[PDB]
């Protein structure tokens, strides 16, 4: 078994279906069949797993050891990687995080446009640039077959979901969790509010999910040289919840956890639209802008941080009723 689970929590194990990913998609009936597999793993357990090629597991590890050398930087060191533009950059809460948005620099027209969330991101140097950079490449060309794969498996129409995510708006969540000796959870239940969530964590283990009611928590233990994919509510909204979107918690463990939350998102300028096929016939009037969700969100949940204080006295929120912002 293990035991891998946090302390104090009652959960079931779960038992996940790992798979491997064409490194290019093309339709084939291998790659329809593959896509209607991992359709029903994320209908049955809402999580599935996936197997990480040499190269994609060498990309980790060097991501993995950045992490842990940011997080080994002085609290000062850190607190200073912030940006007035971008929402890049370090949170201290009770875990912590170093989110990587787009970086984008001062001299890019959308960021000397005072574009709403984009800017450079805060680097402390250009060690960590390279490393979780190159896994965040990485990681981009995993999600665009698995929605790729997602359009074989339901059947949709070619490019239904690449269309978007063309300069999509990906960002990580680089976390760190303390030990447990809030004051007894490191994140509450709560639903992604994207397309998808490619993760990686490392041997500690603290995450939990919650899989599709039939017509309690499941303990996700950390398995070696494989990934985990859950959707967000982005996912839930285009596919009337034929895919879910999977809540999902984290607890502390007797010790530290390093963890990674890879967002793979539409484009800043995309207008997400309900599948027709799939809404029996009847699609909502409602669309989602992804830069105004986006904006909404982060100006909402780091409300006291420089970037939305900036956002109010520039007024940004303007350049979104704009519609150079809502074209990709
Ligand atoms: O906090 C999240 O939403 C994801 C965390 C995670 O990836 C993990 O702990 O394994
Ligand atoms: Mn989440």
Same mark, same amino acid.
């Given at each position: 078994?293990?035991?891998?689970?946090?302390?104090?929590?009652?959960?079931?194990?779960?038992?996940?279906?790992?798979?491997?990913?064409?490194?290019?998609?093309?339709?084939?009936?291998?790659?329809?069949?593959?896509?209607?597999?991992?359709?029903?793993?994320?209908?049955?357990?809402?999580?599935?797993?996936?197997?990480? !090629?040499? #190269?994609?597991? /060498?990309?980790?590890? *060097?991501?993995? &050891? +950045? !992490?842990? #050398?940011?997080? /080994?930087?002085?609290? *000062?060191?850190? &607190? +200073?990687?912030?940006?007035?533009?971008?929402?890049?950059?370090?949170?201290?809460?009770?875990?912590?995080?170093?989110?990587?948005?787009?970086?984008?620099?001062?001299?890019?027209?959308?960021?000397?446009?005072?574009?709403?969330?984009?800017?450079?991101?805060?680097?402390?140097?250009?060690?960590?640039?390279?490393?979780?950079?190159?896994?965040?490449?990485?990681?981009?060309?995993?999600?665009?077959?698995?929605?790729?794969?997602?359009?074989?498996?339901?059947?949709?129409?070619?490019?239904?979901?690449?269309?978007?995510?063309?300069?999509?708006?990906?960002?990580?969540?680089?976390?760190?969790?303390?030990?447990?000796?809030?004051?007894?959870?490191?994140?509450?239940?709560?639903?992604?509010?994207?397309?998808?969530?490619?993760?990686?964590?490392?041997?500690?283990?603290?995450?939990?999910?919650?899989?599709?009611?039939?017509?309690?928590?499941?303990?996700?233990?950390?398995?070696?040289?494989?990934?985990?994919?859950?959707?967000?509510?982005?996912?839930?909204?285009?596919?009337?919840?034929?895919?879910?979107?999977?809540?999902?918690?984290?607890?502390?463990?007797?010790?530290?956890?390093?963890?990674?939350?890879?967002?793979?998102?539409?484009?800043?300028?995309?207008?997400?639209?309900?599948?027709?096929?799939?809404?029996?016939?009847?699609?909502?009037?409602?669309?989602?802008?992804?830069?105004?969700?986006?904006?909404?969100?982060?100006?909402?949940?780091?409300?006291?941080?420089?970037?939305?204080?900036?956002?109010?006295?520039?007024?940004?929120?303007?350049?979104?009723?704009?519609?150079?912002?809502?074209?990709?």
């Amino acid at each position: 078994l293990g035991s891998t689970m946090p302390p104090n929590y009652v959960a079931r194990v779960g038992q996940l279906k790992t798979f491997t990913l064409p490194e290019t998609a093309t339709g084939s009936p291998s790659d329809v069949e593959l896509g209607k597999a991992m359709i029903n793993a994320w209908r049955e357990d809402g999580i599935l797993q996936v197997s990480m !090629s040499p #190269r994609q597991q /060498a990309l980790f590890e *060097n991501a993995s &050891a +950045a !992490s842990k #050398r940011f997080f /080994a930087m002085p609290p *000062n060191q850190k &607190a +200073a990687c912030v940006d007035t533009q971008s929402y890049a950059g370090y949170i201290a809460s009770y875990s912590e995080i170093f989110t990587v948005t787009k970086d984008l620099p001062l001299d890019e027209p959308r960021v000397e446009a005072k574009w709403p969330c984009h800017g450079p991101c805060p680097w402390p140097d250009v060690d960590m640039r390279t490393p979780i950079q190159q896994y965040m490449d990485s990681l981009g060309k995993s999600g665009e077959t698995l929605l790729q794969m997602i359009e074989y498996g339901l059947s949709l129409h070619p490019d239904t979901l690449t269309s978007l995510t063309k300069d999509g708006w990906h960002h990580l969540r680089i976390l760190r969790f303390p030990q447990n000796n809030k004051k007894g959870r490191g994140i509450g239940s709560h639903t992604d509010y994207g397309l998808l969530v490619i993760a990686a964590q490392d041997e500690v283990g603290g995450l939990f999910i919650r899989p599709p009611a039939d017509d309690r928590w499941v303990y996700v233990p950390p398995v070696p040289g494989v990934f985990t994919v859950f959707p967000g509510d982005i996912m839930q909204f285009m596919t009337n919840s034929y895919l879910p979107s999977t809540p999902h918690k984290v607890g502390l463990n007797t010790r530290e956890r390093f963890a990674f939350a890879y967002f793979h998102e539409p484009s800043f300028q995309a207008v997400v639209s309900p599948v027709a096929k799939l809404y029996d016939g009847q699609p909502p009037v409602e669309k989602i802008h992804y830069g105004t969700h986006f904006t909404n969100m982060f100006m909402r949940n780091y409300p006291d941080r420089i970037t939305t204080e900036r956002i109010i006295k520039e007024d940004r929120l303007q350049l979104l009723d704009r519609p150079e912002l809502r074209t990709q």
